[PDB]
Design a binder for this molecule. Structure first.
Ligand SMILES: CCCCCCCCCCCCCCCCCC(=O)OC[C@H](COP(=O)([O-])OCC(O)COP(=O)([O-])OC[C@@H](COC(=O)CCCCCCCCCCCCCCCCC)OC(=O)CCCCCCCCCCCCCCCCC)OC(=O)CCCCCCCCCCCCCCCCC
Ligand SMILES: CCCCCCCCCCCCCCCCCC(=O)OC[C@H](COP(=O)([O-])OCC(O)COP(=O)([O-])OC[C@@H](COC(=O)CCCCCCCCCCCCCCCCC)OC(=O)CCCCCCCCCCCCCCCCC)OC(=O)CCCCCCCCCCCCCCCCC
Ligand SMILES: CCCCCCCCCCCCCCCCCC(=O)OC[C@H](COP(=O)([O-])OCC(O)COP(=O)([O-])OC[C@@H](COC(=O)CCCCCCCCCCCCCCCCC)OC(=O)CCCCCCCCCCCCCCCCC)OC(=O)CCCCCCCCCCCCCCCCC
Ligand SMILES: CCCCCCCCCCCCCCCCCC(=O)OC[C@H](COP(=O)([O-])OCC(O)COP(=O)([O-])OC[C@@H](COC(=O)CCCCCCCCCCCCCCCCC)OC(=O)CCCCCCCCCCCCCCCCC)OC(=O)CCCCCCCCCCCCCCCCC
Ligand SMILES: CCCCCCCCCCCCCCCCCC(=O)OC[C@H](COP(=O)([O-])OCC[N+](C)(C)C)OC(=O)CCCCCCCCCCCCCCCCC
Ligand SMILES: CCCCCCCCCCCCCCCCCC(=O)OC[C@H](COP(=O)([O-])OCC[N+](C)(C)C)OC(=O)CCCCCCCCCCCCCCCCC
Ligand SMILES: CCCCCCCCCCCCCCCCCC(=O)OC[C@H](COP(=O)(O)OCCN)OC(=O)CCCCCCCCCCCCCCCCC
Ligand SMILES: CCCCCCCCCCCCCCCCCC(=O)OC[C@H](COP(=O)(O)OCCN)OC(=O)CCCCCCCCCCCCCCCCC
Lengths: 243, 318, 57, 35, 206, 96, 106, 346
């Protein structure tokens, strides 16, 4: 097979070899942001930048078009039971497929509800962001992501917004609209996934707007001017209203 | 089984000669490259033997074929010496078939459903094959030398460009007609062994599988596989010794490992490599013999069945 | 054969869990040391097809 | 024990324990140590 | 030394890629060689960049290194193992020496017999049925219907059945359909089964 | 020589090459590939101006995907078949 | 690969060393697990720079009540099955040695 | 008498058994002409459909690489309309239709003909399920091995033809079409140019044909209880069985085809020898002995599944329709079923 010559294959092989030889694990980035004010980190060496209760602030039960999807199950059940169309055995049995597939979109919506960030922290060095979220069943998932892997989207959520000049924070510091950011690589439950979109709801307080914007735009934060606040206010498995 | 034979129709001598010549011609034309690869593998392994371990023990026929093709000669490079090989095979087949048919006609049983025992048939076939191989030895020598030229260093090559050219060069440069019969004893031994180690196992397994599964069509080909395997097992050492004797150049300095005879070559092979060294190129030899036997049997059976139907024999008599 | 426990049959303590995790990650790195990275694999898969008719855009 | 002598017939009373062709009994047949 | 046994000099030795970096002949028995240690610079840099704001690590750009083949099991040395296990009868004392090298280690050997091991079910069933012709010599043979009126009329009844089918009663039964149509025809001295009967023709009497 | 301590050319196994294996044109193509493996990048011909279509001048976000992938890739080259996507996708099948 | 700050790790565990903190950060653990592992290692004296094998899974140096520093090695263990236990004498995970006599000297 | 080996012909006496059915009886429709005709028809149709699908998918990908993919139904409709009118799409359709005609006649037709030849006589059990299916395994294996290398020359010719179009004018052969390239390559580069290093294609074809034909034949009889007792839809059951068969064939065939990427496309470590020494067989052995399946199962669908599975599914359906999987079933207590009628009612 190799004896067959194809310039496209040769170009692909050359591109792969050149990439492997040139690009290394270590990379140089000049996107460094120096905050004006000193950063007060928690007792754990982290600074909280975002907080919200997406499950509390979202619609769970009566959601469109999932109500429409689930309202047709009785119709199919009645049609199968009474055979109003006078169908054959297999034809009438074919009507029982819909009840087994109508609830899947609601399951996917409930799963997506757990990708709205509940809590966001920036670690020492301004290179790691910890995002904590929860599922509708109360399971809590926390994941650490490097700041460079964030990419904000436009308000319409259909395109990548310019990282440098992005207008998603109001003058005071809060979000104009529910922000969306795509993480190139997300490690969730010890499994790496590609191009995962997460959301910050507009109905959520934003702490340290400068740090939040820097993390969103992917800049590495300079944390040289820092202080440590020894306050043990948060307990393990602490309760919250995101249930 | 002594009355299980059905010899209700026997071809004439001229028909046998013509059919054998044509079928052997096409079979040799088809299967020559495998023999070429086998000879090249034997030459390249001569003096070293098998040094791989476990599953890699041996020489890869595909590797040898790829190396030969990489020389730039294409597929025509695998047919070098094909003229000499075909001439030698034709002469051997003609002589062997003539002698075998003459003896068989002389000593045949009267009854049509009775046939000579396997022992007697093997004795006659071995005698005929030995005589034919002794008569036609120089052609095999020329073909083997032409094949080994590529493997050997340029200075050791003979540069034969045809059967007659090689015969003349051997007669003149080496001196005398005796130089044309080098390896004749080895060729005779190989021919006798191959003749006696093919007809027996084939019938053995064919009858056994017929008894087991009754009358079917795959029985003939399964028996052919078995017979080819056992014939290769029996004959490959003799073929290797014959190849070594043929490749032995006249000049000892040219020779990498000089030999004085069949026994001397066997002793040298045993010394410089284990007994397994007798079976280099076994896969190539097995493939060659099986393909040749299959094509020959298929064509001969088709033609013979057609002739029998024309004559008017019953379905079972065919 | 290689034992799956790596010498730590039970994670009775978080220290044992950490040791097992460290050695497991090292072993996985060693085993994956001989295959291309995610980017290379993805680009090769995406641009595998090379059979077109008209060129010179 | 074929073409290679490993055991010691001096310390072995009988060399017929195992097949071989390189061992011979020190006290051969017809040999009788008598005071 | 012999170059014929050296893969580097002898090109006829087919190197096994799956055994690269492993030499069974060099094992210790007991094995006391370290071939694994901390490995970095593959995906995790060996240098420090935790506080480097101008450097971001991209694990995706993993440079390709030499494949690490799984360790090969030890291969037996016939002469060494035979000498080690050999014990002199009335010359050796019955004891175990202090040295641990005397432990009898298991080393893999030729793999040819394992082919027969893998094929054993096929071989065993063939020996049980085909070689012994169990239950009988006819079960595994291709089935052929008996020839016409063979071996006897009482058993075959071909002619009587043909007459019955050709009779008025046979035609009426076929019309009722409880009895299927005739499956054979009596030709000039031979019985030929119809192609729709789904059976082979009777074997020739010779 | 008879001694096997050192290799000798008498046992050399290298068949002489007389011409390119697949022809002079194939040899020339191989040389051209070696010389310009990456510098020559032919591309398929596609129209550059389509009314209805919108040119693809940037990378699109994941929100534009009609289908959601199940498997994934670790950054070290490992291929993950078991993912949270698979975990959520297996619920209906297991239930049924 | 989200390596935590070695200075922060040292601050959270005052007595740990910069080299140890950097090595822990290099180790592929989430920052919380890195901090916890650093705390445990400093508190026990465990030498994190030890490549675990099938002989010993870790080593530590501890000063006993007599003032002497002694080395403690954590043996590789098995779940109630010596047959499953790997009896080896090399820093290797692979089970290379096969013993016909489990108790050579009885 | 003719050469060294003698094909001894022997006569045997009569033998018969109680039952004349459920063994091997060659079907009357099993002939060289009829089997070849049916196989050629089915293979040609399946290859045409598969090649059209592949051309359409590849042209859609090519258009999407330069224009944003559809955002809604109207955008998808206009995208398909603009794909259909591409000159590249039309040329690819023509050339790949020629390639389908060639391969489906010489590869899929050969596979179907050999399978029918070696498996037509296996009768089934009346009012029951065909047991002793192991007898069919040797036949399917023989057919798969025999017909495995019948597609490698055509595939290599296609690859050479497509790779010639991407070379400069000076170094371009200038093949008018796929048929012209196929006719010219044997005389220009030589026959071995279409067979060198063919192990990946050969093993792929072997696994495909074996695990497709044998699995479909096994399932269509063993799962027949669904429509024989459960009164399920026979056509739907057969469609499900064909889908399972084609999926299994793709799964068992793709890993062997992955050797192409590992040996040729994976980057080479500078200063070190090739991991597999450039041997596809050795790479396949390494894949077979590899611990993790996902590593060589990556790219299963984006690369091979949609280029192979639909063709195999259509081939199975057409073979079933024509009757290449139809066995003969007769009652064992009928007139021709057994030679002992005295105990069929007593
Ligand atoms: C320890 C072994 C244990 C047993 C296992 C065996 C293993 C063996 C291999 C491994 C070990 C190493 C070898 C040891 C061998 C030991 C035995 C021995 O001595 O054999 C050597 C012996 C000879 O080998 P060699 O020493 O190499 O000598 C041969 C030369 O290389 C030949 O040189 P060349 O090729 O150059 O020849 C040219 C040709 C030159 O040609 C000439 O002869 C020229 C002169 C005559 C010209 C005229 C010819 C006729 C034509 C004219 C007719 C008249 C005119 C007609 C009309 C006009 C038209 C023609 O010469 C010949 O024809 C042949 C040489 C003799 C010529 C002298 C005259 C002979 C007259 C009688 C024969 C006549 C017919 C010959 C042809 C055959 C029939 C067709 O070979 C064998 O015996 C072969 C192997 C053994 C075969 C038998 C099987 C034994 C084992 C059975 C199974 C046991 C199982 C149980 C275990 C038992 C353990 C004990
Ligand atoms: C022509 C055949 C036609 C086809 C039919 C064949 C049917 C065969 C039997 C089928 C069923 C079992 C098949 C097992 C095959 C694989 C065996 C295996 O694991 O590889 C060897 C393997 C050695 O390789 P390894 O363990 O991987 O690594 C160590 C190294 O090899 C290095 O180890 P090392 O340092 O110890 O060096 C010595 C090594 C180097 O040699 C080799 O590896 C050469 C290749 C293996 C040859 C094995 C057989 C040798 C002849 C044994 C004859 C009896 C002992 C007399 C002295 C023989 C001296 C040669 O030799 C051995 O280790 C072989 C020892 C064999 C002992 C045999 C007696 C054990 C007691 C009987 C138990 C089984 C009873 C079954 C029947 C029950 C009926 C109710 O040793 C074993 O696992 C021992 C297995 C022992 C039992 C099975 C084999 C004996 C079967 C005898 C015939 C039974 C026939 C019954 C039906 C017909 C009745 C008429
Ligand atoms: C004997 C009977 C014969 C019958 C007739 C047979 C005739 C021949 C049929 C031949 C069919 C060939 C199909 C080729 C498809 C090639 C796709 C491809 O390249 O994929 C590469 C793709 C990766 O591509 P990529 O470029 O890397 O993607 C990156 C993008 O960022 C990510 O991608 P993206 O988000 O940008 O995606 C763009 C999107 C293109 O963008 C759009 O979506 C625009 C169009 C919107 C409208 C969508 C369809 C509307 C309704 C019409 C449906 C017509 C279907 C016709 C074909 C049916 C058979 C496939 O393209 C796709 O992803 C695929 C679209 C294709 C349609 C999929 C939905 C089909 C629903 C069918 C419902 C039933 C219809 C019944 C009709 C009546 C007659 C039967 O990977 C795959 O191959 C994965 C495919 C996975 C498919 C299955 C997913 C569900 C799995 C769960 C199990 C379900 C099955 C259970 C077992 C059942 C059997 C036992
Ligand atoms: C039965 C229990 C009853 C009591 C309850 C007990 C509690 C529940 C059971 C225990 C927990 C099981 C958890 C399983 C899921 C684990 C996570 C996962 O998604 O796995 C992917 C994971 C690979 O993901 P990864 O780690 O990301 O891969 C990275 C590398 O590629 C490294 O990859 P690699 O080198 O390991 O290669 C992976 C490759 C190689 O995998 C294998 O070859 C493994 C063995 C497969 C064959 C045996 C299973 C049965 C096959 C079908 C038999 C026909 C009838 C089926 C229905 C009735 C019988 C169940 O597998 C795959 O690529 C996909 C495998 C199939 C995944 C199925 C996803 C759904 C799992 C949930 C249960 C589904 C039940 C429906 C029926 C089963 C559908 C598969 O592979 C596995 O964990 C292997 C196991 C896969 C599922 C089978 C094991 C459970 C069932 C055992 C039944 C044994 C008897 C069957 C007799 C059948 C007679 C006809
Ligand atoms: C220490 C070594 C000493 C060596 C020298 C002294 C001893 C020599 C011993 C020689 C033994 C030869 C055995 C031949 C093979 C027999 C095998 C056998 O019986 O198998 C059973 C079978 C029995 O066959 P069957 O005919 O009974 O029927 C088989 C079918 N059933 C079983 C149903 C009856 O025999 C064969 O198949 C034999 C086939 C080969 C026959 C030919 C043998 C060689 C003849 C050579 C003739 C001369 C050639 C030219 C020589 C020129 C130079 C002089
Ligand atoms: C038992 C009593 C007899 C007397 C005592 C025993 C003395 C004789 C001992 C002989 C030992 C075996 C020697 C051959 C070993 C071959 C090993 C091997 O496979 O090498 C690799 C070779 C390599 O062959 P290759 O070169 O084709 O390589 C292909 C393999 N790859 C792809 C991996 C490279 O393999 C073979 O040839 C396999 C078949 C071997 C068949 C050996 C038959 C030996 C028969 C000798 C006597 C003649 C037959 C008599 C009986 C039948 C006829 C009546
Ligand atoms: C777990 C293992 C066992 C699996 C179950 C097997 C059950 C049957 C026994 C077979 C044992 C060997 C394996 C062969 C499998 C494939 C062939 C097969 O199964 O044969 C059956 C079939 C004829 O059977 P059929 O006529 O359909 O039976 C009903 C008739 N009313 O025959 C055919 O289709 C023709 C096949 C011809 C070739 C068969 C070769 C078999 C070789 C077996 C090993 C022989 C070893 C001999 C050793 C000798 C030592 C001196
Ligand atoms: C065959 C028995 C031996 C084999 C192993 C059996 C294991 C049993 C484990 C329990 C779960 C499986 C369900 C039971 C077995 C299959 C159904 C069966 O036994 O057939 C009979 C059943 C009911 O028919 P019945 O009413 O009894 O017929 C009287 C007619 N007057 O007929 C039906 O209703 C048909 C139902 C078929 C379901 C098959 C499911 C298993 C096969 C693999 C999965 C197939 C998935 C795709 C199915 C597509 C169907 C269109």
């Amino acid at each position: 097979l190799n004896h067959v010559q194809n310039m496209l294959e040769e170009n692909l092989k050359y591109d792969a070899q050149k990439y492997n030889d040139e690009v290394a694990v270590i990379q140089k980035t000049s996107r460094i942001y120096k905050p004006t004010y000193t950063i007060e980190f928690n007792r754990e060496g982290e600074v909280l930048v975002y907080s919200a209760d997406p499950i509390k602030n979202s619609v769970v039960y009566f959601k469109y078009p999932y109500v429409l999807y689930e309202a047709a199950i009785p119709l199919f059940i009645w049609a199968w039971i009474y055979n109003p169309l006078e169908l054959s055995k297999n034809a009438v049995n074919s009507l029982l497929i819909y009840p087994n597939i109508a609830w899947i979109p609601r399951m996917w919506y409930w799963r997506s509800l757990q990708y709205k960030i509940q809590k966001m922290y920036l670690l020492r060095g301004g290179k790691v962001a910890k995002i904590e979220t929860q599922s509708l069943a109360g399971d809590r998932f926390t994941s650490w992501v490097e700041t460079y892997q964030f990419h904000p989207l436009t308000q319409d959520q259909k395109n990548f917004d310019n990282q440098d000049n992005a207008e998603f924070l109001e003058d005071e510091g809060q979000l104009k609209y529910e922000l969306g950011v795509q993480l190139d690589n997300l490690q969730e439950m010890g499994t790496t996934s590609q191009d995962i979109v997460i959301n910050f709801m507009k109905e959520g307080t934003v702490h340290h707007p400068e740090l939040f914007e820097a993390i969103v735009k992917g800049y590495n934060i300079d944390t040289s001017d820092y202080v440590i606040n020894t306050a043990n206010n948060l307990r393990a498995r602490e309760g919250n209203h995101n249930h | 089984m002594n009355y299980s034979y059905k010899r209700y129709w026997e071809p004439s001598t001229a028909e046998v000669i013509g059919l054998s010549l044509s079928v052997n011609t096409i079979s040799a034309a088809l299967t020559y490259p495998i023999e070429f690869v086998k000879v090249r593998s034997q030459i390249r392994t001569e003096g070293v033997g098998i040094r791989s371990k476990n599953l890699y023990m041996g020489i890869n026929p595909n590797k040898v074929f790829r190396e030969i093709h990489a020389t730039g000669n294409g597929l025509r490079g695998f047919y070098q010496g094909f003229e000499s090989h075909l001439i030698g095979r034709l002469s051997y087949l003609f002589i062997r078939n003539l002698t075998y048919k003459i003896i068989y006609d002389r000593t045949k049983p009267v009854k049509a459903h009775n046939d000579l025992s396997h022992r007697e048939k093997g004795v006659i076939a071995g005698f005929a094959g030995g005589l034919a191989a002794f008569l036609t030895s120089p052609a095999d020598l020329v073909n083997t030398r032409t094949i080994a030229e590529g493997g050997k260093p340029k200075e050791w090559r003979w540069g034969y460009k045809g059967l007659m050219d090689g015969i003349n060069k051997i007669a003149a440069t080496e001196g005398g007609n005796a130089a044309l019969f080098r390896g004749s004893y080895a060729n005779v031994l190989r021919a006798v062994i191959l003749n006696i180690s093919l007809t027996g196992p084939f019938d053995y397994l064919n009858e056994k599988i017929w008894i087991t599964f009754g009358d079917m069509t795959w029985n003939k080909y399964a028996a052919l596989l078995w017979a080819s395997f056992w014939g290769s097992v029996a004959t490959l050492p003799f073929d290797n010794i014959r190849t070594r004797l043929y490749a032995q150049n006249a000049d000892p300095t040219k020779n990498r490992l000089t030999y004085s005879g069949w026994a001397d070559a066997a002793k040298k092979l045993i010394q410089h490599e284990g007994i397994s060294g007798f079976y280099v190129g076994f896969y190539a030899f097995y493939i060659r013999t099986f393909l040749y036997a299959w094509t020959t049997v298929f064509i001969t059976d088709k033609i013979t069945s057609d002739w029998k139907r024309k004559a008017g024999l019953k379905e079972w008599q065919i | 054969s290689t034992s799956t426990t790596l010498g730590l049959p039970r994670w009775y303590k978080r220290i044992s869990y950490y040791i097992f995790k460290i050695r497991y990650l090292q072993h996985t790195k060693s085993k994956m040391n001989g295959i291309p990275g995610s980017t290379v694999r993805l680009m090769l898969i995406n641009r595998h097809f090379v059979e077109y008719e008209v060129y010179e855009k | 024990c074929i073409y290679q002598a490993y055991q010691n017939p001096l310390r072995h009373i009988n060399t017929g324990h195992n097949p071989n062709n390189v061992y011979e009994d020190i006290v051969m047949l017809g040999d009788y140590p008598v005071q | 030394y012999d170059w014929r046994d050296d893969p580097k000099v002898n090109k006829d030795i087919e190197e096994d890629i799956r055994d690269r970096g492993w030499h069974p002949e060099t094992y210790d028995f007991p094995y006391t060689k370290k071939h694994d240690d901390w490995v970095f610079d593959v995906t995790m840099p060996s240098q420090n960049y935790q506080t480097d704001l101008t450097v971001n690590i991209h694990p995706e750009n993993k440079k390709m290194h030499v494949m690490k083949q799984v360790m090969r099991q030890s291969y037996w040395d016939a002469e060494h193992d035979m000498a080690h296990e050999y014990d002199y009868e009335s010359e050796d004392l019955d004891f175990q020496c202090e040295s641990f090298k005397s432990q009898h280690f298991r080393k893999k050997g030729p793999i040819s017999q394992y082919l027969i091991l893998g094929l054993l079910p096929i071989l065993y069933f063939g020996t049980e049925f085909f070689y012994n012709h169990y239950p009988d010599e006819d079960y595994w043979r291709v089935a052929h219907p008996p020839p016409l009126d063979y071996p006897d009329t009482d058993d075959t009844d071909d002619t009587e059945t043909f007459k019955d089918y050709k009779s008025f009663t046979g035609r009426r039964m076929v019309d009722t359909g409880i009895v299927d149509p005739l499956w054979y025809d009596i030709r000039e001295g031979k019985k030929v089964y119809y192609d729709w009967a789904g059976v082979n023709q009777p074997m020739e009497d010779i | 020589q008879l001694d096997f301590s050192h290799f000798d050319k008498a046992f050399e196994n290298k068949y002489d090459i007389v011409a390119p294996e697949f022809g002079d044109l194939h040899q020339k193509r191989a040389e051209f590939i070696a010389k310009n493996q990456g510098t020559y990048r032919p591309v398929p011909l596609v129209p550059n101006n389509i009314k209805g279509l919108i040119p693809k001048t940037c990378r699109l976000p994941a929100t534009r995907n009609w289908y959601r992938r199940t498997s994934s890739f670790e950054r070290n080259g490992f291929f993950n078949i078991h993912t949270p996507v698979l975990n959520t996708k297996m619920i209906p099948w297991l239930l049924f | 690969y989200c390596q935590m700050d070695p200075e922060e790790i040292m601050r959270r565990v005052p007595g740990i060393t910069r080299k140890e903190a950097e090595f822990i950060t290099k180790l592929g653990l989430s920052p919380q697990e890195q901090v916890d592992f650093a705390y445990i290692a400093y508190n026990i004296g465990l030498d994190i720079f030890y490549f675990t094998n099938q002989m010993f899974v870790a080593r530590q140096v501890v000063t006993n009540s007599k003032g002497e520093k002694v080395e403690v090695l954590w043996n590789a263990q098995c779940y109630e099955d010596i047959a499953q236990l790997n009896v080896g004498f090399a820093p290797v995970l692979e089970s290379v040695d096969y013993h016909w006599e489990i108790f050579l000297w009885a | 008498m003719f050469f060294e080996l003698e094909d001894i012909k022997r006569r045997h006496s009569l033998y018969w058994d109680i039952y004349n059915v459920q063994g091997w009886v060659r079907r009357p429709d099993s002939t060289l002409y009829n089997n070849v005709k049916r196989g050629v028809t089915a293979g040609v149709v399946a290859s045409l459909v598969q090649e059209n699908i592949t051309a359409l998918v590849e042209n859609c990908k090519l258009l999407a690489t330069k224009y944003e993919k559809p955002q809604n139904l109207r955008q998808a409709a206009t995208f398909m309309k603009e794909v259909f009118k591409l000159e590249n799409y039309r040329k690819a359709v023509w050339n790949r239709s020629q390639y389908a005609l060639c391969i489906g006649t010489f590869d899929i037709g050969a596979r179907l003909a050999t399978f029918r030849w070696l498996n037509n006589g296996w009768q089934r059990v009346f009012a029951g399920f065909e047991f002793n299916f192991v007898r069919k395994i040797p036949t399917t294996m023989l057919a798969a091995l025999f017909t495995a290398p019948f597609s490698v020359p055509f595939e290599l010719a296609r690859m050479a033809y497509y790779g010639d179009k991407t070379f400069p004018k000076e170094l371009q052969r200038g093949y008018s079409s796929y048929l012209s390239a196929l006719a010219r390559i044997p005389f220009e580069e030589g026959p071995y140019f279409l067979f060198k290093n063919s192990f990946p294609l050969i093993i792929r074809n072997f696994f495909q044909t074996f695990t497709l034909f044998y699995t479909y034949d096994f399932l269509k009889d063993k799962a027949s209880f669904a429509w024989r007792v459960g009164e399920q839809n026979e056509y739907a059951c057969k469609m499900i069985i064909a889908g399972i068969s084609t999926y299994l064939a793709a799964v068992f065939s793709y890993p062997w085809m992955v050797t192409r990427e590992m040996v040729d496309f994976w980057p080479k470590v500078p200063g070190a020898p090739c991991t597999f020494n450039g041997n596809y067989r050795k790479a396949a052995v390494w894949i077979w002995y590899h611990e993790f399946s996902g590593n060589y199962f990556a790219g299963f669908f984006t690369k091979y599944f949609w280029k192979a599975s639909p063709g195999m599914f259509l081939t199975l359906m057409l073979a079933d329709k024509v009757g290449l999987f139809d066995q003969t079933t007769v009652d064992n207590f009928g007139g021709a079923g057994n030679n002992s009628w005295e105990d069929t009612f007593v």
